[PDB]
Structure formats: structure tokens, C-alpha cells
Enzyme design. Structure first.
Site, PDB file in Angstrom:
ATOM      1  CB  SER A   1    -107.321 -34.713 -52.431  1.00 60.20           C
ATOM      2  OG  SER A   1    -107.451 -35.777 -53.357  1.00 60.20           O
TER       3      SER A   1
ATOM      4  NE  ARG B   1    -110.456 -34.133 -59.549  1.00 58.22           N
ATOM      5  CZ  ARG B   1    -109.296 -33.757 -59.021  1.00 58.22           C
ATOM      6  NH1 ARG B   1    -108.376 -33.178 -59.781  1.00 58.22           N
ATOM      7  NH2 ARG B   1    -109.055 -33.959 -57.732  1.00 58.22           N
TER       8      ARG B   1
ATOM      9  CB  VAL C   1     -98.859 -10.142 -59.533  1.00 62.61           C
ATOM     10  CG1 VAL C   1     -99.133  -9.379 -60.820  1.00 62.61           C
ATOM     11  CG2 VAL C   1     -99.798 -11.333 -59.401  1.00 62.61           C
TER      12      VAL C   1
ATOM     13  CG  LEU D   1    -102.869  -9.426 -56.077  1.00 70.44           C
ATOM     14  CD1 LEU D   1    -103.735 -10.397 -56.865  1.00 70.44           C
ATOM     15  CD2 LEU D   1    -103.536  -9.051 -54.763  1.00 70.44           C
TER      16      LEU D   1
ATOM     17  CG  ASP E   1    -102.461 -39.198 -56.752  1.00 72.62           C
ATOM     18  OD1 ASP E   1    -103.168 -38.722 -55.838  1.00 72.62           O
ATOM     19  OD2 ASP E   1    -101.263 -38.880 -56.904  1.00 72.62           O
TER      20      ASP E   1
ATOM     21  CE  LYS F   1     -95.810 -12.419 -70.486  1.00 68.78           C
ATOM     22  NZ  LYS F   1     -94.755 -11.391 -70.268  1.00 68.78           N
TER      23      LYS F   1
ATOM     24  CB  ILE G   1     -93.120 -37.922 -72.459  1.00 70.04           C
ATOM     25  CG1 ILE G   1     -93.208 -39.286 -73.143  1.00 70.04           C
ATOM     26  CG2 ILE G   1     -92.449 -36.903 -73.373  1.00 70.04           C
ATOM     27  CD1 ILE G   1     -93.887 -39.242 -74.495  1.00 70.04           C
TER      28      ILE G   1
ATOM     29  CB  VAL H   1     -97.136 -39.015 -72.658  1.00 74.21           C
ATOM     30  CG1 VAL H   1     -96.866 -40.488 -72.390  1.00 74.21           C
ATOM     31  CG2 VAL H   1     -98.003 -38.843 -73.894  1.00 74.21           C
TER      32      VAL H   1
HETATM   33  N1  LIG Z   1     -94.988 -29.282 -53.568  1.00 69.40           N
HETATM   34  C1  LIG Z   1     -95.462 -29.756 -52.422  1.00 69.40           C
HETATM   35  N2  LIG Z   1     -95.269 -29.088 -51.280  1.00 69.40           N
HETATM   36  C2  LIG Z   1     -95.772 -29.583 -50.061  1.00 69.40           C
HETATM   37  N3  LIG Z   1     -96.464 -30.792 -50.110  1.00 69.40           N
HETATM   38  C3  LIG Z   1     -96.620 -31.430 -51.292  1.00 69.40           C
HETATM   39  C4  LIG Z   1     -96.128 -30.923 -52.442  1.00 69.40           C
HETATM   40  N4  LIG Z   1     -96.435 -31.777 -53.426  1.00 69.40           N
HETATM   41  C5  LIG Z   1     -97.110 -32.800 -52.897  1.00 69.40           C
HETATM   42  N5  LIG Z   1     -97.219 -32.593 -51.577  1.00 69.40           N
HETATM   43  C6  LIG Z   1     -97.915 -33.435 -50.535  1.00 69.40           C
HETATM   44  C7  LIG Z   1     -99.204 -32.743 -50.116  1.00 69.40           C
HETATM   45  C8  LIG Z   1    -100.214 -33.371 -51.012  1.00 69.40           C
HETATM   46  O1  LIG Z   1    -101.534 -33.168 -50.493  1.00 69.40           O
HETATM   47  C9  LIG Z   1     -99.781 -34.797 -50.822  1.00 69.40           C
HETATM   48  C10 LIG Z   1    -100.355 -35.691 -51.923  1.00 69.40           C
HETATM   49  O2  LIG Z   1     -99.795 -35.301 -53.180  1.00 69.40           O
HETATM   50  P1  LIG Z   1    -100.784 -35.213 -54.400  1.00 69.40           P
HETATM   51  O3  LIG Z   1    -101.466 -36.546 -54.605  1.00 69.40           O
HETATM   52  O4  LIG Z   1     -99.843 -34.800 -55.631  1.00 69.40           O
HETATM   53  N6  LIG Z   1    -101.854 -33.822 -54.164  1.00 69.40           N
HETATM   54  P2  LIG Z   1    -103.375 -34.301 -53.484  1.00 69.40           P
HETATM   55  O5  LIG Z   1    -103.387 -35.767 -53.232  1.00 69.40           O
HETATM   56  O6  LIG Z   1    -103.665 -33.337 -52.147  1.00 69.40           O
HETATM   57  O7  LIG Z   1    -104.599 -33.982 -54.494  1.00 69.40           O
HETATM   58  P3  LIG Z   1    -104.834 -34.937 -55.786  1.00 69.40           P
HETATM   59  O8  LIG Z   1    -103.923 -36.117 -55.796  1.00 69.40           O
HETATM   60  O9  LIG Z   1    -106.400 -35.316 -55.780  1.00 69.40           O
HETATM   61  O10 LIG Z   1    -104.776 -34.050 -57.120  1.00 69.40           O
HETATM   62  O11 LIG Z   1     -98.355 -34.728 -51.023  1.00 69.40           O
HETATM   63 MG   LIG Z   2     -99.635 -38.340 -55.159  1.00 72.23          MG
HETATM   64 MG   LIG Z   3    -103.276 -37.394 -54.366  1.00 73.01          MG
HETATM   65 NA    NA Z   4     -95.346 -36.211 -68.745  1.00 68.87          NA
HETATM   66 NA    NA Z   5     -96.046  -7.421 -56.446  1.00 68.89          NA
END
Ligand SMILES: Nc1ncnc2c1ncn2[C@H]1C[C@H](O)[C@@H](COP(=O)(O)NP(=O)(O)OP(=O)(O)O)O1
Ligand SMILES: [Mg+2]
Ligand SMILES: [Mg+2]
Ligand code: NA
Ligand code: NA
Length: 327
Positions: free
Chosen positions: A174, A143, A59, A56, A184, A66, A100, A97
Site C-alpha cells: 500500500s 497502523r 449477496v 448485488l 506492514d 439476515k 495462533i 495473536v
Molecule cells: N488475496 C490476494 N489476491 C491478490 N493479491 C494479493 C492478495 N493478498 C495479497 N496480495 C498482494 C496485493 C497486496 O497489495 C500485496 C501486499 O499485501 P498486503 O501487505 O497484505 N496488502 P497491502 O500492502 O496492499 O495493504 P496493507 O499491508 O497496508 O494493509 O500483496
Molecule cells: Mg504483506
Molecule cells: Mg502491506
Molecule cells: Na493469528
Molecule cells: Na445475488
DNA sequence: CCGACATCGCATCAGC
DNA sequence: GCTGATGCGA
DNA sequence: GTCGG
């Protein structure tokens, strides 16, 4: 694929990931371990050998070894030992936190501060973000059900239009993808008087109104373009109060709103997929714009975008509902 | 053998 | 005081 | 730690 299919392995790899970030301060080993954890957790067969998993992408040799030790002993000596370690395990914990990071946690544990109680004793050594993080440590790891998210969207869209009905706001993340729960609330915001080739008051006024109706309770950070803070639903009748929640509001120019909406709608892996398709197409997509490569590799000017679908059209992709954007 | 590996806004620190 | 660096969350 | 120039 089912959870306990290779769950023992992916938990192992996620644990190893967090120690790399939080203790060793090796951020690229962190992402590496998670890439392997991700690609394995989607692998629809129970892995038999480290060699089987090595096929994969993500990996390599060291994880293959491991996996062998894990499949043969049910444990990993290095992980068992580091769990035992009072210094390293305390450093790893404190980083839970918000505020932090790997560096601050390293410092606390150096001067004897190891637990939440230790943090609670030493408030004067914490900064504003960290106090809020400590104050809501429990709440922040919970959540948010979609039903609550819907109620939160109600309040936000309402107060925003009430400040100025020409605002445009969209709850992304999301939630927009239809998820049953969220971590969030990600809010994007624009106005017909704010563009690329162009008032700082625009974001502040929204935060203010949301503080007025007591929806926003604390502030982590705040500038002319991005707000990070805490929010809480008002509690009904004489029922048990809602958890405090993480909320982001950022102000985007009208020009760049839908590159913003598309990007912050996610998902993570959809974004990288849709960034690379997209690449073989001769376009470059970031959160701000879509620009055309570019017969040697030059980027032309940013292209006009007036909806999500436009960006799908440029790269000749069929528009896809946020519901299907899991990847 | 050896560098890339996502990216950026804001808070606070380090240095002048 | 200012400017740049560093830490942090996402 | 993994991949690949
Ligand atoms: N590393 C990355 N690469 C591409 N897009 C990203 C990213 N990090 C964040 N985004 C973009 C895409 C993410 O969908 C969007 C919202 O960031 P979140 O709120 O941190 N992740 P979500 O809201 O989907 O789930 P939940 O909050 O319930 O845990 O920001
Ligand atoms: Mg966010
Ligand atoms: Mg989010
Ligand atoms: Na932290
Ligand atoms: Na590989």
C-alpha cells in the site's frame, strides 16, 4: 461511500466472517461473507430491504434474510448468542495473536487457556512465532503512518545498497500506492546474479545487515527466498519509542521481478481485475510470469519482462501509476 | 445437485 | 534420520 | 454462503 451508510450491516457480515474462519473452520464461508461485506460497503445507497441487497453479486438468500432481521430488530440473534458464548468468543479472540490460527486457538481453549494472561502463564506451550505474536500483540494491530514508512524505506534502501550496490530493492504494498497509512512493510529484492535459469547468500546478507544496525529486532520465519520478521525505528532524543512493525523481505529472480513488483504493489482487487482483462486477452498472469494462452488453452513459455509497463503493454492496457491502482 | 471458491513459502507436526 | 502433511500468514 | 456448470 460513507461509513455509517450500511456500516451496521458490513460490521455484522465481517463479524460473521471471522467466526466462520476462526471457530467453524469454514474458510469459504469466511471469504463469502467478506465478498458480500465488500460489495455492500461500496454500494452508494442506504439499503432498505434484504431483497434490495440480494441484487448485488455475492449477496445470496441467507444474507438477504439476515439483513431483514437486522433492519427489523437492530440485531442478529445468532450473532448475539455467539458473542455470549465463552468458548467460541475466546477461540475467536486468541486468533488475533499472530501465529495462533483457528486450530491452535481451538486447542488452547480446550485445555483451559482463554486469554492473553493465560497465554502469558503458559509460554512453554507456545512456539517461536506465537511468542513474538504475543510479545507484540498490541503493536501489531496498530497502523503505520506514511512518514514512518518513508523513514523505514530510508533505512532499508540504504543498508541494502551498502551490502552490495548492485542490489535492487522496492518497497511495494500500500505504501507504493501512495497510501497515508500501512499495515506492514512489503519489500521486494533482486540481484543481477539471480535468475530463473540459475546464491542463497543473497537474502541472508540483507537481513543480517539490517539486524546489525538494529533495524530488525525479531524473526518470524526465514528461508532462501522469503523473510518475515519485526522491525523498529531507532527512537529519537528522549521521546517515546516507536511501535514494533511487521516487515517482509523476499528475494525474486531478475526475470520475475516486475511481475513480482506489480503483484505485490496491489491492490488486492486491482490484481484480480488486471488478471481477468488480461484473460479475455489470452494471457495468464501470476506473481511470477505472464504467459500466452494458447489456442486450445496451453500456456506458451514465460514472456520477457523488463518493467511494469511491459506487462501493461502485452494486455494492451495504458500503464497506470501505483497511485491509481485501488482497483 | 454439487463442486469451486487465491496462492505459496516457511515452521512444525505426523508418520515411517 | 527423512518425507509428506498440516497449520499459518499474507 | 454464493454462484453457476
Ligand atoms: N488475496 C490476494 N489476491 C491478490 N493479491 C494479493 C492478495 N493478498 C495479497 N496480495 C498482494 C496485493 C497486496 O497489495 C500485496 C501486499 O499485501 P498486503 O501487505 O497484505 N496488502 P497491502 O500492502 O496492499 O495493504 P496493507 O499491508 O497496508 O494493509 O500483496
Ligand atoms: Mg504483506
Ligand atoms: Mg502491506
Ligand atoms: Na493469528
Ligand atoms: Na445475488
Amino acid at each position: 461511500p460513507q461509513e455509517t451508510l450500511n456500516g451496521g450491516i458490513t460490521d455484522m457480515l465481517t463479524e460473521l466472517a471471522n467466526f466462520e474462519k476462526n471457530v467453524s473452520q469454514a474458510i469459504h464461508k469466511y471469504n463469502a461473507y467478506r465478498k458480500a461485506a465488500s460489495v455492500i460497503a461500496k454500494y452508494p445507497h442506504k439499503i432498505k430491504s434484504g431483497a434490495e441487497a440480494k441484487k448485488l453479486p455475492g449477496v445470496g438468500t441467507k444474507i438477504a434474510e439476515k439483513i431483514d432481521e437486522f433492519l427489523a430488530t437492530g440485531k442478529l440473534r445468532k450473532l448475539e448468542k455467539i458473542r455470549q458464548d465463552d468458548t467460541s468468543s475466546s477461540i475467536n479472540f486468541l486468533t488475533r495473536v499472530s501465529g495462533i490460527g483457528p486450530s491452535a486457538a481451538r486447542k488452547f481453549v480446550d485445555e483451559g487457556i482463554k486469554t492473553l494472561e493465560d497465554l502469558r502463564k503458559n509460554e512453554d506451550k507456545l512456539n517461536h512465532h506465537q511468542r513474538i505474536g504475543l510479545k507484540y500483540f498490541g503493536d501489531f494491530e496498530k497502523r503505520i503512518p506514511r512518514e514512518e514508512m518513508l523513514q523505514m524505506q530510508d533505512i532499508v534502501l540504504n543498508e541494502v545498497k551498502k551490502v552490495d550496490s548492485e542490489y535492487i530493492a522496492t518497497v511495494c504494498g500500500s505504501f507504493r500506492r501512495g497510501a497515508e497509512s500501512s499495515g506492514d512493510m512489503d519489500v521486494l529484492l533482486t540481484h543481477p546474479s539471480f535468475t530463473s535459469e540459475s546464491q542463497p547468500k543473497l537474502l541472508h546478507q540483507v537481513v543480517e545487515q539490517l539486524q546489525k544496525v538494529h533495524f530488525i529486532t525479531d524473526t518470524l520465519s526465514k528461508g532462501e527466498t522469503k523473510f518475515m520478521g519485526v522491525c523498529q525505528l531507532p527512537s529519537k532524543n528522549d521521546e517515546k519509542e516507536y511501535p514494533h512493525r511487521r516487515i517482509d523481505i523476499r528475494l525474486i529472480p531478475k526475470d520475475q521481478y516486475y511481475c513480482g513488483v506489480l503483484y505485490f504493489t496491489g491492490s488486492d482487487i486491482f490484481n484480480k481485475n488486471m488478471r481477468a482483462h488480461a484473460l479475455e486477452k489470452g494471457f495468464t498472469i501470476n506473481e511470477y510470469t505472464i504467459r500466452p494462452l494458447g489456442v486450445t488453452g496451453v500456456a506458451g513459455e514465460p514472456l520477457p519482462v523488463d518493467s511494469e509497463k511491459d506487462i501493461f503493454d502485452y494486455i494492451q492496457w495504458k500503464y497506470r501509476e501505483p497511485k491509481d491502482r485501488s482497483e
